Design a protein around this nucleic acid. Structure first.
Ligand code: NA
Ligand code: NA
Ligand code: NA
Lengths: 234, 213, 274, 234, 274, 234, 274, 81
RNA sequence: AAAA
RNA sequence: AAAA
RNA sequence: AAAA
């Protein structure tokens, strides 16, 4: 709304074309004590996740008789941001814990383990836009790394509009000053959307262009998640 | 049309298509059949026994209770008529005092306690109950001597083979529970076989490794 | 500290009951006899809470929501020195449903407040720069509190309707310099550009359903809510629920949502006087 | 203490005589999902209550072996008042939750349902004095509407002194600026007091006059509660 | 969020024990040999907490309460710019009774703090306009913290006695302009108009009893507390407990309460020096 | 660091020699309802403790199968200090609750009573330095008074350095303005340390002198605890 | 309200396992083949968290800790008007160990934050009077947040190393008067006098062990941590754990701790560049 | 579903129990798993009093699992009408 | 904090 | 936040 | 409060 988000050369503030992703880096089995672990970086957005494998949930009236219960935490460290975030969970963090959980719920073959809980803890170490998605993907990989069966991996990317241009994988500047910001996550092999939100505004047509660009970006990310996982064995 | 898609022995991943069509494969937690497609649910290794396929998981800290499996448990609690036992699964196992005692519990009576290891078999288990253990078998019951090494349950068949891997190792007197735990008694330097197990989870051969060490 | 968990003791709805609700789906009607694309009977009551600055009681089928506003005078946020404040809260009162116990808002109430908040804020329906008094030093804070009294399905949409209605219904008072508020003297209404609606579309089986009731919400795979302004820009989208949705599913849902919004907006405008 | 509460015509700020009530309006079965519901209005004081019928209390070590446990919530909405009240329970709201609960405890035949809980949730939508009593009466009616057996209904009214005059059913101005303010609730048919408090001050004689005026006002209210309930069937 | 519930694991007192405590009721005496209208032995110790500005340790039978004050300097509340502040807290320490676990004040501690608060505030014993320093900009805040150490029945009355005593015992310090507090220099005592007492009357069966002990409190139908100033104006009334009370019951209780207060007030005055 | 803590006469701000204790006063069985009670005064530092004897811990998954669970609370009253302390537990109070608990854990023969809890509640009524130790000793005595068996009593004292002089049993001034402040507690008959902390700084040699002075002071205190307990019977 | 309780469901470590870990104790080696006095492999990564003002990721054996700082501008505390602020927090993330659930810091995280805090504050490594900007009106607040990611024994020492490293790694920005912070312009690093180390020594049986791993921590009678500056002054001591320690035990532990610190300090200095 | 029976909602303050032995007319066999969540079951109350939850019995004609048909809920107080 |  |  |  103030800075120029698309320059006269038609590129973005970080030099990317509108259809270009930030660089990605994945690491597996980083935490010795967790049943499953991962770090996912997407440009300057960094997340780590730990999974604690299916275990009988004590309550137990919180357990489910037919399936496992997912417990998930999205949380940002105080130094993950530009100004220090208070470590107490914000309304935003609470919402995102639920949105991320519900995304995983469609992936994780939970009925294999009734009366159990599976704990997914993700921390945002660096937040430069798209962290709910980076948190999601870390979680997905940590589950994979923990040997908890799943339908598919989850890949996700945010699309938006900035200065009227539909763009792929927004950096923080684009999120703050852009017109729309729309994170999308799927199980790509199954063509199923697991996370879908929009804030800002778009015409219905912009929404359809933006959505089509998101899928193409997600396929690239998905391939990466797949190699990352296969890497140590190959 | 019936076809397998992946070269056998491939490195497979959750969401990965293994084969298309109508096969007659025993349901398995590592394969998902969605209509006429079959996908892997885990990071694993594709395999084709004869005409059937399977995914061998490469990950997982957890054991899944199977009736009649032999496991080594860790007593984690003492109840009024039995013991609570950790057999490294999602669910805790139970050991009825009547099973261990072969009789009812007497007035004022108090064999196994917390921190004890117990080799046992699973007398009961299903989707709707926790595993019940039985020690009424030869060589079952409390574990006195020796050591216990923990490893990924998913790695147990790789320490086994055509009984191959086992033979190698004992050249040392070990026992490999399905539990994903291994009883041993060797002296303490010989025990450092432990390092050779670690390398097996580290590479799912080692013969050379133990002659020099 | 806190984490999101899969809900345990929920409205367990019998097998036979599910099979029945679909049944009529094949023929384009539901239990209550409506078409997959109809909203239930809508009722809006303004100035319902007399000590609110603005209020609206909303009955949508059996779902019942009371939105109230209070205006206060404040310093502005430093990140927004030329703008009033909007603060949205939603309580899911234990009065709404047998399984809602009391306490601080759970993830559900919070998610609701935030989706309404976004729809309001991102639509620009309420221009916050209009709530300034002496720029940089004092602005109006609009407190919007939303109370679900009867939980009968599609709570989100009703919260949005109630919120918009309460805002349009908001009385503003004369400010006196010396800076006080004379509540004896109403000097106008909160300035809104236009109304906004949220349209929730549940996926139940092979079927997409507008404005799910309680029974339908308890058998739905997931739902997806789209917010619209009168020019039918999309100003908020939120998928919720444990199930996934195909790409075509979401495409057809927005098309259906948007179509429904046209009618809902006319209806809302009728009720609001505008 | 500042405004004139009794005018030269000897009437009150709202035109009432000292022995006159505010108008009353009752509504039953307003909430479809609750086992019992009611709205009670007394002048500008508005309250709604929902009851959730006897149900096994999970804990269960909180349950009672011989009777049911009443759980009750008095709470005021942020917009129920002149300046926005924070929704977090105040000390006052906590006290009143207990006082109201204890009032109901004498009415509700709890021993019929041992090991159960009965939940009573009351919300103040408009607060112009006397809301604890209006909340109480709503609760009483909601219990009646839910078919939970009781000894009697509960009727209540606040009496006070303003400018030295004993007065019936105070409006908010009289409460804030008056000398004494004394809410009283009974099961009138049984002559039993269930709620009794005074804040402010009175001579012992004033206390006795005020108390006698309260009973007379309560009988009028009681008749109303009785008709309200009988209305739909008649 | 939070709700009031009927207390579950309480002091279950055996049938035979009840039948005995009544027994002596017919003859106008209780277990400890007192008359239905007597208070237990009273003991008051001032300046007991040395770092308090004012304190009093109160022993009433086995019930034991320690009230302490701290004075601070503050801006006044906007609704009371010409008045100091009074803030009352009561902790029912897990030290008082086996069933009092620790944490934030339960409804009981809060109700106690508020009843004392009212009795103090509504009696005008402490004139808050006397605690002003520079009107509108700075006043004294009197913090009264009340700690129940031994729970032996009739906690409320003892809290009131302790509170009044701690207030009368409060030292005030010289204020220095530059506005600091020189705590080396006591310049007076908090100004009080008079003392106040609360008199609790339990209904046990056909009987009304002043100053119930623990056993009696656990078999009482309900109780009712009346606060008095020396001119014997009623300055606070609170019914508590699960049972009801007839109109005549309450009438006779105040008559009895007031009669008891005369004696209690003389006694308290003796202890306070006044 | 500002006031002179050791005067030209070589004595301390309260007139004590560096190797001299504050006066001590102990009282037992002060609370009728507690299973065990004590007040310990050390100069101006005052503490009271109540013990609630071994009792089955309800949870019960918090209980221990082999021993009793100690639950302990260190808390300071708002008027215990110079400026009013907020009654909400501070970080400091939380730490000290744990340090004190762990001290008691070495004393109390907990395995006598498996699956139970023993509650220890200590309140600081007057805080002029060393209260964690005074709280500890009160707790120890309250346990003794409650007949809960123990290995030994616990005696404790803080030593420090002020203006370069090693000193015994610091008053509040010495704690605030001194160079080091080192509370130490033991079961003296067994020669076992139960509580040990230092804040401030000391050379390793100063640490050894200070520690040796602490033991000598603890033996004096220990004798007192022993007489105090024997007093009523003798 | 809140109390400290003896931990219940802990890492129950089998009898045989204990007997083995001692075994090699007789010969001066441990499971991992180290000498009773060695630290595990140490790894430090600075500027690891890119949006921190200063950060260090610390790997010590399997224990993993990430310390990050953020600097803000504030009014100073009234008790310290000529000094910046230091605020230390430690989170033991549920990511570190299976039994660490989420929420506000338990006594463990708090005790950790406070021991580091003291070691930092009482060593004078960070001179708070250096963080003043306009004395009495504005100072820097150093927020140090410490996140344990992998709990593998001796968490305290690692938190200290991480804390010191993050501080040395802290970038400071130009302040602009008008008083803003230009984060485009780094104008220096936080000024530290020197590093500090904490050295934890576990007592396991007849044995004293430096830098206990997880298995050893779970069989240790107690542990004791000593903090040192480079001149080897003792700047913090903390005994923790349920067991006691003889006087000679503690004497020998400090002697051993101090000896270890010399090496640890050189090592840390290497990593920090200093 | 409990280890030896089912928990059943018979629309009262208390939940009802159904012993597997009653439905099976015999003990539960090793590894065995008739009725599950969402199933309707016509049954009789074999046991109940002020001090226990209702125990159900399906050992009767036409009792047991409900396959076909529908189920309408109404106020219990309205049944005789 | 108190008052609604 | 630290100190009591 | 919103944004990361
Ligand atoms: Na959440
Ligand atoms: Na309450
Ligand atoms: Na603690």
């Amino acid at each position: 709304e103030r800075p120029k988000l698309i320059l006269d050369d038609g590129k973005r503030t970080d030099g990317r074309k509108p259809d270009e992703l930030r660089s990605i880096k994945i690491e597996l089995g980083v935490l010795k004590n967790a049943d499953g672990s991962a770090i996912f970086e997407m440009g300057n957005t960094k997340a780590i996740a730990a999974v604690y494998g299916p275990k009988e949930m004590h309550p137990r009236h919180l357990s489910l008789p037919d399936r496992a219960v997912l417990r998930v935490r999205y949380h940002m460290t105080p130094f993950s941001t530009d100004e220090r975030k208070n470590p107490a969970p914000s309304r935003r963090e609470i919402e995102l814990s639920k949105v991320i959980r519900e995304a995983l719920e469609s992936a994780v073959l939970v009925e294999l383990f009734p009366r159990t809980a599976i704990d997914v803890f993700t921390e945002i170490l660096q937040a430069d836009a798209g962290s709910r998605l980076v948190s999601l993907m870390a979680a997905s990989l940590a589950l994979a790394d923990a040997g908890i069966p799943m339908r598919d991996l989850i890949a996700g990317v945010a699309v938006g509009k900035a200065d009227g241009v539909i763009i792929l994988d927004l950096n923080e500047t684009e999120a703050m000053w852009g017109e729309a910001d729309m994170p999308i996550a799927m199980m790509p092999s199954l063509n199923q959307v697991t996370l879908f939100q929009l804030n800002g505004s778009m015409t219905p047509d912009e929404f359809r262009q933006a959505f089509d660009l998101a899928v193409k970006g997600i396929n690239i990310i998905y391939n990466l998640e797949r190699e990352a996982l296969k890497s140590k064995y190959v | 049309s019936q076809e397998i898609v992946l070269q056998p022995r491939s490195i497979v991943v959750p969401g990965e298509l293994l084969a298309e069509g109508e096969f007659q494969i025993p349901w398995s937690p590592y394969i998902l059949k969605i209509n006429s497609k079959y996908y892997s649910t885990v990071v694993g290794l594709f395999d084709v026994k004869d005409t059937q396929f399977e995914v061998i998981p490469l990950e997982g800290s957890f054991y899944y209770p199977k009736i009649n499996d032999i496991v080594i448990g860790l007593v984690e609690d003492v109840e009024i008529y039995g013991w609570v036992v950790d057999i490294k699964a999602p669910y805790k196992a139970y050991l009825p005092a009547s099973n261990l005692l072969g009789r009812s519990i007497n007035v004022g009576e108090d064999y196994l306690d917390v921190g004890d290891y117990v080799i046992a078999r699973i007398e009961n288990f299903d989707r709707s109950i926790d595993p019940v253990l039985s020690v009424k078998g030869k060589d079952l019951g409390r574990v006195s001597n020796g050591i216990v090494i923990d490893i990924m349950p998913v790695k147990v068949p790789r320490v086994i083979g055509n009984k191959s891997m086992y033979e190698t190792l004992t050249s040392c007197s070990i026992f490999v529970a399905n539990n994903g735990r291994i009883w041993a008694t060797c002296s303490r330097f010989s025990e450092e076989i432990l390092i050779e197990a670690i390398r097996k989870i580290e590479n799912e051969l080692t013969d050379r490794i133990k002659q020099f060490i | 500290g806190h984490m999101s968990s899969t809900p345990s003791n929920q409205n367990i709805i019998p097998i036979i009951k599910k099979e029945s609700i679909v049944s009529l789906f094949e023929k384009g009607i539901r239990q209550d006899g409506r078409k997959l694309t109809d909203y239930r009977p809508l009722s809006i009551t303004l100035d319902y809470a007399k000590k609110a600055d603005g209020s609206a009681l909303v009955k949508l089928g059996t779902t019942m929501v009371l939105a109230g506003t209070k205006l206060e005078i404040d310093k502005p946020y430093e990140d927004t020195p030329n703008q009033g404040n909007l603060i949205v809260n939603v309580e899911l009162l234990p009065l709404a449903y047998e399984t809602f116990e009391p306490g601080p808002p759970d993830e559900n109430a919070i998610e609701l407040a935030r989706v309404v908040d976004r729809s309001l804020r991102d639509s620009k329906a309420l221009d916050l720069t209009k709530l300034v008094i002496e720029p940089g030093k004092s602005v109006w804070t609009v407190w919007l509190d939303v109370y679900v009294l009867d939980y009968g399905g599609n709570v989100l949409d009703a919260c949005t309707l109630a919120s918009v209605a309460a805002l349009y219904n908001t009385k503003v008072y004369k400010v006196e310099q010396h800076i006080s508020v004379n509540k004896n003297e109403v000097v106008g209404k909160l300035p809104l550009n236009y109304p906004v609606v949220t349209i929730s579309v549940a996926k139940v089986d092979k079927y997409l359903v507008v404005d799910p009731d309680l029974d339908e919400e308890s058998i739905m795979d997931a739902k997806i809510s789209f917010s619209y302004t009168p020019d039918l820009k999309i100003v908020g989208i939120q998928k919720s629920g444990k199930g996934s949705m195909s790409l075509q599913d979401i495409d057809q849902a927005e098309n259906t949502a948007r179509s429904t919004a046209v009618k809902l907006l006319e209806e809302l405008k009728k009720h609001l006087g505008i």
